[PDB]
């Protein structure tokens, strides 16, 4: 409504915006750690069988 009240609404909104973006970015990089390991495991297994 008035300048104190619109700013109180602003503070809440960017808090949610920022938080959500942090979680979303976290899940993409958390899957990134994992996908690096599974893929590395497969590639390494195939070659070790050729070497063996």
């Amino acid at each position: 409504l008035t300048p104190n009240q619109v700013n109180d609404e602003l503070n809440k909104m960017q808090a949610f915006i920022r938080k959500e973006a942090e979680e979303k970015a976290k899940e993409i990089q958390l899957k990134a750690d994992q996908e690096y390991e599974i893929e590395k495991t497969n590639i390494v297994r195939n070659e070790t069988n050729n070497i063996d």
Partner: protein, 56 residues
Amino acid sequence: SQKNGIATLLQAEKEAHEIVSKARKYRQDKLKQAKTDAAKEIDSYKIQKDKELKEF
């Protein structure tokens, strides 16, 4: 402070996009590393094999 706040929110959604993209670039790179560090992982196991031939 109404139109000073709108400006802050349009920016925040842009930032939200960018934060997500930074992670999206990182994910693609981590996949390229998987192949390279797996290629380095095989020329260390080929010498581990050669070791036990020379031992023999």
